[PDB]
Write a protein that binds this ligand. Structure first.
Ligand SMILES: Nc1ncnc2c1ncn2[C@@H]1O[C@H](COP(=O)(O)OP(=O)(O)OP(=O)(O)O)[C@@H](O)[C@H]1O
Ligand SMILES: Nc1ncnc2c1ncn2[C@@H]1O[C@H](COP(=O)(O)OP(=O)(O)O)[C@@H](O)[C@H]1O
Ligand SMILES: [Mg+2]
Ligand SMILES: [Mg+2]
Lengths: 122, 187, 487, 470, 81, 311, 128, 105
């Protein structure tokens, strides 16, 4: 029993890296990465995996963080490094978006070029 | 980080902690040293006063870890075992450490190459033929191996021997032969 | 006799002792035993408990083995020794099982001694692929006029017998088993059909009475009966269909033809649901596990027809399904309808209205069907089905009443194909349209007696050439007209 | 590359512990020491250098501690024109006893869906020769179709009639994926395609590739065979530009297979017991079966409906992925009307007056209106009898019964059941016949004159025969 | 849905009551149109009884399915703790 | 062996043994209780612990109480003098007429007769009642469902079946009281005393009574049908009789099994019933058969819940 | 007490549905395995062992009695709910009250076609 | 004396998990520290589940729980006639105490 009570954490803990702004993936499956560390991360804060994938810290648990992955989890392995970005989600807003087709994060997907807005909003 | 897994693999929180300890010791070659260490720790804990001091779910974790760090600085324990008991106090798995101790024992019990043999007989065993059976059971092993033979007796098996080498099992008892002959004459 | 025991039960008696691998029971309860040890045991391997029971290594886990106990768990205690068999669960197969009643594991429960089987076959073998198979062509004769005419069954088919309780499903299966006696005694060895009856969740008295019905009809000599009755453990009722199916795959693989009846599959699904719920597995529709479809589909896929490169044998399966209140749209009925090649819908309305066998002709179908019918039966049955569809449409009207009165049949009386052809001919050509319906069966009876006592040459001709030629057409015409004048 | 040890075997779920070099998710692993090739697909990373995998074959005879080898890539199947005329299984091995499939390239069965900028918008009607389909829910070239239906209502017969008509008139490298279906039907299709010349065992100019994982396969094979066939079709579409046809039967099995392993992967179940990832799994699989600007894939999928629900999460989730749904009903098939298509539940996206024309659209809408009126009247018809209706109501009931009967049609593949020879009605005959039945031009014919006919000419001929012979 | 089936069942039940009452009064007054009314109301009452039987079957099926679904909800909710 | 209680949660009780565990379906006696409290081993939990269900109230049980093993599932006093006498699941006299001074004790939870012991012939059990023997004849070793109520004469029909089977044949009867109202049980006792089927002053009683009332834990109500089945199996298999076994409600047997399996923490089934509903009904109804020694014929009053025959 | 001391008592539980709800909450928070509608397994037991203490003692035990009038609140007249099922199977009859009869002027709104009394005719006075 | 005296280990929405009380009987009335009483419904190996005859805001982790030695009982008798009591027999009509001389389980 215990998510962070894995033998690797336990052995290198009894034996003797920044675990405040950085974590390591304990388990990844079905788009839910458990991350040990990230002690400074906020609830619903967006974090960055080693493969460029982003995640959202949805479960702040006493010994790990349940992060939901914004993509395909085939690019995330156990032991991967997870960094903080310090920010909640935000999307670009403005008049520059009219006529554009974007995805759920405000990235253009119609190939007409990147969005040219000036302001972002949570 | 890479981990060194022992030849036997134990399970539960006991197995996980003992596996962590073994893979920590194998990187520095202090296996029997920390064996001595946890032996002393277990005999320290088995005394009733400090045991009830650490078994109390009313003592707050800082207080009990304070007493534990004091008593482990008392006996000049290696940083490895001090860290292990600190983790058992942190994760609250402390009351179970005895199992961990036992676990580690069994782990190193296959590090030196011992195999446990258990010989049951219907009669309290003699000396000569007992040594004879010891010699016979030694022939089933590879070199560098030791027999942990512990012969207890069951006077209900009506004769013969029931030998258990690891989990290999030979039932030379006579009650089973009686049951088999009855089954044969019945079917 | 003192020599019936001392002959070899002591001289050659496997009294030897051997280095065996063992485990120890940790917990037993809810039909699953947790076993510590058995490090080298395989997935789905048979193990043997200290009490003489047997089990299947289901869950290989890091620290224990979850074993399915094939029996009553009241005989297992914590600390019992569990030995390895080294063999994945398998049952005895061979010719020596014909005439024997066995339990789901292959042990004789008829008191006639041990089954002298030389070959064992796994219960969980995978069905043949796409290439080993070939289309169904040979007829599997049931001896029932309604089935053999309108819902024909071929060798290698899967035909569901579905219906409410007490509507005549076992009776159809037992008639089909009794009917194969005329072929099993003949000379052509490519028409012999060895039947297998798997009794799942049934009353044991009902199975004993079934075995007596088969023995009086002298049909047990070519029939295996696998019995996992109402009082047997749920794992045994779960295993019985696969045991019977391996016993039939023995014949299917060696150029012979087998027939298997699963009586019934609803009770096997109930037993599997018990085993699954006791394993804390998530329940789906009607609390059934997610893989109950797989449960029945891997079973009914093994009933196949092999080509002449793989022996040319077959295995026909007649699974039985019991519906509640006539609901065919239920979960398990629709599962098995999705697996099989057709159905035989038995109705309570027809059964109560004296129409027995109570087959619903409008709903009974046979996806293969016509490809495995004789020519004479095809000639008469095409027109019979056309006229029956016409009659059910307007529910000519008197012709339909005549034909449905003609489709009634008695129990334990399977007719040869030629006699069914004669009766259906006398029915579909009009030679009883003016006969008032109440006597039709009587006429039928008398007529058939006629044709079997005095015109045996015509029936033999029909049997030989397989079709009802123009010569035999006019011959049977004059026969039935002379009888109708005499009747 | 990396080597690990089996640490747990539960059904089709095998846990493998690795010393060094953990394999990424979706990788293929080869279990060492087996008679045939057993492939495990990584699904999760449990931690402790352990992975959880799903087995593509049986797991019996597996021992804890058995060696497992990592391939370094997902399941790769051979793709190319050399797959035409061959049968392959979930992992790309030939199961037709004709030797290895010697293609120049292999593709992983897990790929990314085409982007939004690659979607194609064109909508051209695909004429199938079936009256109810071409009239009430016309199919589209390059669109996803889907055929819903319970157990034994006509899914396979309808999909084989579609195979016959379209795939025989076609010239674009069809592909057929049998997912969790009868092995007997797979053999039947193989041999009817051999004797029809579509599969050429010698002098290879075949134009259909078959991929089969049937009812007898474990859940992993039944959950990935759809992806295997999908991968074959994706190769034919992208790296050749061909106009591919893809037939999938049955695709519900895919979803079902996932459910059978969901519980074993340690996941809390959803509503009816399904996996929590039902919709996203269906999305990752279904968004790859699509027409792009690179090529065209006309996708016909049979979709099983459990216990005739249609609100079961699997059919309900599938509905949103199709452009022309054809829903078969059991209540209609119990009337003898085949194909048992439900006229008031089958939809299409090209059922637009600016695509099919005002004549076709108005005739279809009028047929559906009359059938809906009859449906609403059925209750008082069953209670108070038809004798208590108005005269206009009796007229609409008569025309509605006539339209019901005319919607049925004998199939070439159903001569064994219908007795009649299969009729292939062109589109204009369908439109004209139904327009005339609507206008009232056959108020005198008996309703049985429309049951199981071709165009309306055969209905008039059948009425004449009924009138003269009776 | 359970409440829909219950509403429709009560509808057909009151209809059957009304039609059997009309059959009674028609057989009373008949002692050529009253005869037709009596036989037609008999037909209506027996047809309503058939529809009531079928809807009662479907109602029992649905209420069993409802009990199953709610129990599975409770069970899966308890097993997550 | 002697064990100690380690957990009491309602009606289930965990007992831990030191020397030898009792097998499943084994009566454990709890020590120090005023009355006789019997647990029945239902599960082996590991760590030498055993989960049992209690056949009586568990109030006042304290962790550490001594639990004595018995060796047999439950042994009821069985013999020709249980007749005209009331006893509970444990086989203790309820009628306050002293102990049942019988010579032998039979264990509950027997096995159904083997296949070779079955009778291959179906035979009518003549009951002497015109409407029964003519239109719906009873079969030797069969099960019959009384779809009766209160207004109809059902106690009279039961008593007359007892009388007729005892006279036309030599068969004694057993009346199981599965989950029965204590008031109705007293009524039936006095009605059967009045009509001469039970004789309080002689040895000519033709029925033995077994009662597990409604105020008893689910274990008692689940095993009470097996108690009567055992006291009937004795008559059959050791007197060659054609016994007649009544089960006053067979639905309450099912619901008592359902409650028991719910207490043991098992996942329910369609509608809420035990996952072992079919096997639980079967392991009981299979002991009611017609062996080569005699026959038990069972009359089982049926209750259909919500008037659904597909429940 | 009154029953055992030769007196006669009557007891009304108003109502048992709410006692069953309280017990369901208690047992659900004690982590006991829930059943139908999250009720514990012995929720039948809970009521049966309560309603079986209402008895009529013979004159050898004092001759007292205890009459129970438990109350049950159904939802939309559903008597095949779990707790109404239990208490209907436990008691010696029931007195159904209906709203549709409540508003038709029938007050007390006793539905007599459904109301039962198994031991009632033996209780009435000779005149009544 | 951890055999006739436990110490509250957990408390939540009416349920007290009490550690100790090794000699308590099943369904026995125990007395918390703040005066509220409870019934020991669950006897588990490591703790006792007690249902509280009151509110949870008054008891918290670490409180003491004493043992009464008798199963739950109620004052019975003639003296209750005319009196409105609660589920334990305590008078809530303000007319004084109950003059009950007999208690009964
Ligand atoms: N063709 C028939 N003609 C006349 N009577 C028949 C016929 N078939 C069956 N019966 C009678 O009706 C009864 C039906 O029993 P049968 O076992 O055949 O149906 P079943 O579907 O298997 O019912 P169960 O669920 O109890 O096994 C039989 O006892 C038999 O006596
Ligand atoms: N177009 C049709 N004409 C006549 N009968 C049909 C037609 N389609 C289906 N049927 C009948 O319905 C049955 C089921 O057909 P099939 O498609 O194979 O079932 P499934 O839904 O499992 O795929 C067939 O055996 C056939 O008798
Ligand atoms: Mg049967
Ligand atoms: Mg299909």
């Amino acid at each position: 029993t215990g998510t962070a009570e894995m033998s690797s954490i336990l052995e290198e803990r009894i034996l003797g890296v920044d675990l405040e702004e950085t974590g390591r993936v304990l388990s990844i499956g079905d788009g839910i990465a458990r991350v040990h560390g990230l002690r400074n991360v906020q609830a619903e804060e967006m974090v960055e995996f080693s493969s460029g994938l982003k995640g959202m810290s949805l479960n702040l648990e006493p010994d790990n963080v349940g992060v939901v992955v914004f993509g395909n989890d085939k690019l995330i392995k156990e032991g991967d490094i997870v960094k903080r970005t310090g920010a909640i989600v935000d999307v670009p807003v403005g008049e520059e978006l009219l006529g554009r087709v974007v995805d759920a994060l405000g990235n253009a997907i119609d190939g007409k070029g990147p969005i040219g807005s000036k302001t972002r909003r949570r | 980080a890479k981990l060194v897994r022992p030849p036997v693999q134990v399970y539960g929180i006991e197995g996980r902690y003992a596996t962590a300890l073994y893979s920590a010791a194998s990187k520095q070659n202090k296996l029997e040293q920390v064996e001595k260490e946890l032996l002393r720790v277990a005999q320290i804990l088995k005394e009733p006063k400090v045991a009830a001091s650490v078994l109390n779910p009313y003592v707050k974790r800082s207080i009990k870890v304070k007493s534990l760090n004091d008593i482990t600085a008392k006996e000049r324990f290696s940083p490895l075992t001090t860290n292990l008991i600190n983790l058992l106090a942190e994760n609250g798995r402390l009351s179970n450490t005895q199992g961990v101790v036992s676990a580690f024992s069994t782990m190193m019990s296959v590090h030196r190459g011992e195999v446990p043999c258990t010989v049951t007989s219907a009669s309290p065993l003699e000396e000569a033929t007992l040594s004879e059976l010891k010699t016979v059971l030694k022939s089933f092993l590879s070199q560098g191996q030791v027999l942990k033979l512990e012969a207890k007796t069951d006077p209900s098996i009506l004769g013969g021997m029931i030998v258990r080498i690891g989990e290999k099992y030979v039932d030379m008892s006579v009650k089973t032969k009686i049951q088999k002959l009855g089954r044969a004459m019945r079917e | 006799e003192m020599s019936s025991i001392l002959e070899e039960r002591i001289l050659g008696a496997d009294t030897s002792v051997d280095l065996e691998e063992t485990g120890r029971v940790l917990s037993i309860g809810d039909g699953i035993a947790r076993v510590h040890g058995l490090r080298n045991v395989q997935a789905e391997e048979m193990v043997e408990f200290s009490s003489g029971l047997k089990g299947m290594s289901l869950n290989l886990e890091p620290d224990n083995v979850g074993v399915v106990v094939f029996g009553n768990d009241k005989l297992i205690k914590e600390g019992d020794i569990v030995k390895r068999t080294g063999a994945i669960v398998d049952v005895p197969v061979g010719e020596e099982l014909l005439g024997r009643v066995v339990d789901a594991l292959g042990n004789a429960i008829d008191g006639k001694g041990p089954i002298g089987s030389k070959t064992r076959r796994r219960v969980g073998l995978k069905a043949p692929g796409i290439i080993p198979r070939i289309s169904v062509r040979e007829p599997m004769q049931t001896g029932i006029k309604a089935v053999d005419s309108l819902v024909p069954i071929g060798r290698g088919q899967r035909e569901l017998i579905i219906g409410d309780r007490q509507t005549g499903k076992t009776s159809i299966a037992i008639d089909t088993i009794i009917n194969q006696k005329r072929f099993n005694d003949g000379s052509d060895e490519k028409k012999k059909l060895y039947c297998i009856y798997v009794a799942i969740g049934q009353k044991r008295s009902t199975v004993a009475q079934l075995v007596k019905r088969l023995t009086d009809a002298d049909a047990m000599k070519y029939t295996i009966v696998v019995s996992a009755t109402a009082s047997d453990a749920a794992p045994l009722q779960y295993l019985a269909p696969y045991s019977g199916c391996s016993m039939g795959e023995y014949f299917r693989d060696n150029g012979k033809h087998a027939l298997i009846i699963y009586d019934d599959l609803s009770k096997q699904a109930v037993a599997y649901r018990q085993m699954s719920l006791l394993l804390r597995r998530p329940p789906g529709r009607e609390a059934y596990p997610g893989d109950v479809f797989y449960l029945h589909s891997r079973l009914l896929e093994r009933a196949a027809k092999m080509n002449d490169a793989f022996g040319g044998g077959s295995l026909t399966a007649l699974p039985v399904i019991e519906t509640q209140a006539g609901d065919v749209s239920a979960y398990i009925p629709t599962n098995v309808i999705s697996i099989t090649d057709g159905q035989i819908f038995l109705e309570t309305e027809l059964f109560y209205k004296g129409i027995r066998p109570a087959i619903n002709v409008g709903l009974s179908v046979s996806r293969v069907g016509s490809a495995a019918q004789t020519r004479a039966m095809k000639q008469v049955a095409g027109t019979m089905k056309l006229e029956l569809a016409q009659y059910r449409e307007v529910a000519l009207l008197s012709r339909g009443v005549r034909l449905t009165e003609l489709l009634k049949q008695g129990q334990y009386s399977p007719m040869a194909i030629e006699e069914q052809v004669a009766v259906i001919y006398a029915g579909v050509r009009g030679y009883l349209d003016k006969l008032e319906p109440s006597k039709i069966t009587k006429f039928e009876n008398a007529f058939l007696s006629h044709v079997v006592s005095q015109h045996q040459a015509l029936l033999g001709t029909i049997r030989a050439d397989g079709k009802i030629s123009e010569q035999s057409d006019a011959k049977l015409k004059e026969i039935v007209t002379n009888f109708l004048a005499g009747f | 590359a990396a080597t690990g040890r089996i640490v747990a075997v539960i059904g089709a779920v095998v846990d493998v512990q690795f010393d060094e070099g953990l394999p990424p998710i979706l990788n293929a692993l080869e279990v060492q020491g087996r008679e045939t090739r057993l492939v495990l697909e990584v699904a999760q990373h449990l931690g402790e250098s352990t992975v959880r995998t799903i087995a593509m074959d049986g797991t019996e005879g597996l021992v804890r501690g058995q060696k497992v080898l990592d391939s370094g890539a997902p399941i790769k199947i051979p793709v190319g024109p050399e797959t035409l005329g061959r049968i392959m299984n979930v992992i790309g091995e030939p199961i037709d006893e004709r030797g290895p499939i010697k293609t120049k390239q292999f593709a992983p069965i897990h790929a990314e869906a085409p982007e939004f900028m690659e979607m194609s918008v064109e909508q051209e009607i695909l004429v199938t020769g079936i009256k109810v389909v071409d009239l009430l829910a016309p199919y589209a070239k390059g669109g996803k179709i889907g055929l819903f239906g319970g157990a034994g209502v006509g899914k396979t017969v309808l999909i084989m009639e579609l195979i016959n008509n379209v795939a025989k008139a076609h010239g674009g490298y069809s592909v057929f994926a049998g997912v969790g279906e009868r092995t007997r039907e797979g053999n039947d299709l193989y041999h009817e395609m051999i004797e029809s010349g579509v599969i050429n065992l010698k002098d290879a100019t075949s134009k259909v590739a078959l991929v089969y994982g049937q009812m007898n396969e474990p859940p992993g094979a039944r959950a990935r065979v759809a992806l295997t066939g999908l991968t074959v079709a994706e190769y034919f579409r992208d790296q050749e530009g061909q106009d591919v046809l893809l037939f999938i039967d049955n695709i519900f099995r895919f979803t079902q297979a996932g459910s059978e392993v969901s519980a074993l992967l340690g996941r809390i179940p959803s509503a009816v017991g399904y996996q929590p990832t039902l919709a996203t799994d269906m999305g990752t699989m279904q968004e790859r079966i699509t027409t792009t600007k690179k090529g065209s894939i006309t996708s016909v999928q049979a979709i099983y409906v459990p216990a005739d629900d249609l609100t079961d999460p699997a059919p309900a989730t599938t509905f949103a992925h199709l452009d022309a749904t054809t829903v078969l009903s059991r209540a209609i098939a119990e009337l003898g009307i085949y194909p048992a298509v439900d006229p008031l539940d089958s939809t299409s996206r090209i059922m637009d007056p600016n695509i099919v024309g005002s004549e076709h659209y108005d005739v279809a809408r009028g047929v559906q209106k009359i059938l809906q009126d009859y449906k609403s009247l059925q209750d008082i018809i069953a209670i108070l009898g038809m004798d208590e209706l108005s005269e206009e109501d009796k007229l609409t009931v008569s025309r509605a019964r006539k339209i019901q009967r005319f919607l049925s049609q004998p199939f070439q593949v159903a001569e064994v059941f219908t007795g009649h020879m299969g009729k292939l009605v062109p589109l204009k005959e369908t439109i004209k016949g139904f327009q005339q039945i609507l206008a009232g031009e056959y108020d005198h014919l008996p309703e049985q004159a429309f049951y199981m006919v071709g165009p309306i000419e055969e209905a008039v001929a059948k009425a004449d025969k009924l009138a003269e012979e009776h | 849905t359970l409440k829909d089936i219950t509403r429709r069942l009560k509808s057909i039940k009151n209809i059957q009551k009304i039609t059997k009452s009309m059959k009674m009064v028609a057989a009373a007054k008949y002692a050529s149109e009253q005869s037709a009314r009596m036989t037609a109301m008999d037909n209506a009452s027996k047809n309503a009884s058939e529809m009531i039987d079928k809807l009662t079957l479907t109602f029992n099926r649905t209420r069993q399915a409802v009990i199953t679904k709610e129990l599975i909800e409770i069970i899966s909710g308890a097993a997550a703790l």
